[PDB]
């Protein structure tokens, strides 16, 4: 089971407006990884310029006291995952990210490292999407075609990051985020969808899940009214 | 070739705020279908309640002087397409729509009816997406998984419907529509992306294409600055 093995920090978004990269969650990253993790394995696949992405993430994690290895600089990404002390998958285009995880044979390897070996996993945004059962509730454009929407399944429910309340000033006739999720929940056997607004994130420790941050999360359950939850809320019931 | 065979009316959105279903484009529908088309074959697959969707579309098209058959009430959808005088694919969830076109074996049948038999095609929003080479530039959530993102290819370029200018009042850190398309244009061999704002639509007659409506279209070319185009603009250069 998961009880003493699963460690996830699932961030909705990397940056608050006017703030620094990972600044709003930097204390939680520090607590989550702890003092005994020396190096973090970064996965930059969600963005096109992997070199510049790794440089940005390395600057921040080195400022936090961690070395940073990018899997795109490893000659054997599978081996890099098998040796990682901690894994951070950054945001970007979720379809591009998931296809690249499949293309580099990393789905099973990351699953084993996190769920069986207890290696801590950080996701930001698209990296949070691929931590879930599937990317059915990403906001991103399908710029490439992954072989499946199934992802790492580190948790069995879906997440909608960057969750956005409807705009009352708006005459735009496109779907609201809630309307899009409602349509998902018309399809067969779909699981709960956790809408993490920007500024909030989910800490998973075994079979415990906790909302952290400074904003509310909107939970979408199939056939039910959406419910709103304050930082500190216990989401353990979403875990098996 | 296409010169005297292809007839498309590609609408960005069905309804102006405060207006009626297809009201803003109803005159163009009338000119496009003409007086000799008696019945329109409707494809409601983009929405979950196909019965209610067909009822809504039937009310409008009957008010415009056309009978309406919904392919979801046909016992052989392929045969219904082969006999259609005109085809209208309505908006909804583009992934759900495309998967259902594939599931009902309608991609080839619709392609033949439109491109070889000269049958007029109307798309609205998601129905405009599936008229293009692929649905890579839909705004919709991947609530189901079609076998491919390739669509009808009635035109060889991509369309982004409901195109939305960035919000200057907004502190939301999610991608702007332009940022999403730019990422598409980082992938290999991608074609032009026509951003149809709400209120504008594309009329295709053979190898001629014209912007119609009351709003501007933003054209995205790979590696180039986006360009803005007024109603009446000649987009024929996007066609082969
Ligand atoms: N593209 C987003 C993910 C999403 O909104 O689904 C990000 O990684 O920032
Ligand atoms: N879901 C939209 C299509 C899109 O925005 O891509 C519609 O059919 O209205
Ligand atoms: Ca991010
Ligand atoms: Ca529509």
Walk me through what this model shows:
Chains A, B: It catalyses: Dipeptidase E catalyzes the hydrolysis of dipeptides Asp-|-Xaa. It does not act on peptides with N-terminal Glu, Asn or Gln, nor does it cleave isoaspartyl peptides. Chains A, B: Its EC number is 3.4.13.21. Chains A, B: The active site is at 125 (charge relay system), 140 (charge relay system), 162 (charge relay system). Chains A, B: Keywords: Cytoplasm, Dipeptidase, Hydrolase, Protease, Serine protease. Chains A, B: GO terms for molecular function: dipeptidase activity; serine-type peptidase activity. 2 copies of one chain form a homodimer. By secondary structure, chain A is of the alpha/beta class. Chain A has one domain (1-240). Helices cover 25% and strands 21% of the residues of chain A. In chain A, strand 6, helix 7 and strand 7 (193-197) form a beta-alpha-beta unit. Chain A is built from 7 helices and 11 strands. The interface between A and B is large, with 37 and 37 residues. The complex binds aspartic acid (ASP) (2 copies) and calcium ion (CA) (2 copies).
Write a brief caption for the model.
The PDB classes it as hydrolase. Two copies of one chain form a homodimer. The first copy, chain A, is α/β, with parallel strands linked by helices and 240 residues long.
Could you tell me the radius of gyration of chain A in angstroms?
17 Å
The total domain count of chain A is 1
Bound molecules: aspartic acid, calcium ion
Assembly type of the chains comes to homodimer
Number of helices of chain A: 7
Termini separation of chain A: 9 Å
| Structural class by helix and strand composition of chain A | alpha/beta
InterPro entries (chains A, B): Class_I_gatase-like, Peptidase_S51
Keywords (chains A, B): Cytoplasm, Dipeptidase, Hydrolase, Protease, Serine protease
EC number (chains A, B): 3.4.13.21
Active site (chains A, B): 125, 140, 162
